[PDB]
Symmetry: D2
Subunit: 119 residues, 4 copies
């Protein structure tokens, strides 16, 4: 599958993921420094039988920004595709929703994009 | 009362979820739309210690659209918050990315919004 | 069917003229201090098979009184009939430094109706 | 500033004029999709902050001209960042006209970055 291992985004974040035989993604999302206070559980899913026509492999995962040290009362989901090869990539778009009151719900969700590489 | 239970979105999809003590979301999703049949595995995360100021509970989950029956070569993530009340609700926005070639990647991702209630609309 | 006054789910008012050349022009009120210019485009020759009419518009949140240094775009479709609607999703980008650009853009949805 | 000819990462051409009143006007030529030139209109912050922040802006293209009509429209929302290599960084939504039953799949999302040099 080529997904299991450590990936790095464009802004100094790191995630270590295991892609299970059944389609499970499990691992940890952290900062470049990697101190315990920056590490969070991740969990998601991927297509364990992708097409063989040159298409990427669809996948997604979630991090809720609570660990044993802090809690931002928020969660990010990344949705994207893995592309293999010597320059392997995971290309994603993300949604970051914070817990808000109803009056503030209109501004609860940020959107962006992350590109992950193995180096 | 809480996240654990059976939920339905505005189109009649069925979201059966368990919120574990450790922050884990597990369960199954059955889609009323798209290249989908029967139940699919979901996993996700939620804030197990939300704020006490009246804010909702942040969460998210993923379905890869492969099961024993079909494989759409795609995955949806829902990102949102649970809001408790007399009519409990989970308000989400979602991204649905298909596996594509590089030339087609620009059109790989749909976006929308789903609202879930424990009462079927 | 697009020209006129529209109201979203949260008390904003959208006053628009749909011109023959595909232009959308008008004002968005989120009174004078709360009124902002809007411009956009719409499909002036939509299908007649039950499909909606695609459209989009932008408001930059500056007027003669205030400036939030931000802009919202709404992308969606007009649906005519007895309960006509404009169903949209939106992106709100603020001007930021590069270090804060990752959190520059909010996303959401607005539904507009011809009655409050 | 914003006025000029820009190119996205896929080779589309964005010819824009930023007027004194906050107006954006011009033409867009897409290197992608069911698309020659199309009219665009939008708005920008004509008095940005003076603290190093970018200039917020957005614009719309309806994909109808004298030669094709895709029954769809794209909005780009983003900010202009000046400097040695000026750049406009955007996220976009592309909505097609659909029936109600197909409305759930009416909107595509992505991100475009524009420079004054072709990719």
């Amino acid at each position: 599958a080529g997904i299991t291992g450590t990936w790095y985004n464009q802004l100094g974040s790191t995630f270590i993921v295991t892609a299970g035989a059944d389609g499970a993604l499990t691992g940890t999302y952290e900062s470049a420094v990697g101190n315990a206070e920056s590490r969070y559980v991740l969990t998601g899913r991927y297509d364990s039988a992708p097409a063989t026509d040159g298409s990427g492999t669809a996948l997604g995962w979630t991090v809720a920004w609570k660990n044993n040290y802090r809690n931002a009362h928020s969660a990010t989901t990344w949705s994207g595709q893995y592309v293999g090869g010597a320059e392997a990539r995971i290309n994603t778009q993300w949604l970051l929703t914070s817990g808000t009151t109803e009056a503030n719900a209109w501004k609860s969700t940020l959107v962006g994009h992350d590109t992950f590489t193995k180096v």
